[PDB]
Amino acid sequence: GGLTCASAPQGTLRILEGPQQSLSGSPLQPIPASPPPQIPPGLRPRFCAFG
């Protein structure tokens, strides 16, 4: 138990978690565009001129 000074280390291992990327890199999934306003069907001339 003299606890002498040992030599300098050769290198460094570093352990850390890696993320999973099987999900991302996929084609994007955007929010679907709301439709442009379309005229309602069944619009008729309700007003007829008097006389």
Binding site: P45, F47, C48, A49, G51
Partner: protein
């Protein structure tokens, strides 16, 4: 063109009728028209009325 003329007016003023089998248009009771003036947006038929 008679059907376009019938639709560019109020329902009732243009009587489109099959005389020969072909359709011709005539004014029938022009009191019904509201002057929407929609015939003036049809470029071909704004010269015939």
């Amino acid at each position: 063109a008679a059907e376009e003329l019938s639709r560019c007016f109020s329902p009732g003023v243009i009587e489109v009728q099959e005389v020969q089998g072909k359709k011709v248009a005539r004014v029938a009771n022009p009191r019904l028209d509201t002057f929407s003036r929609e015939i003036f947006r049809n470029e071909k038929l704004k010269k015939v009325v």
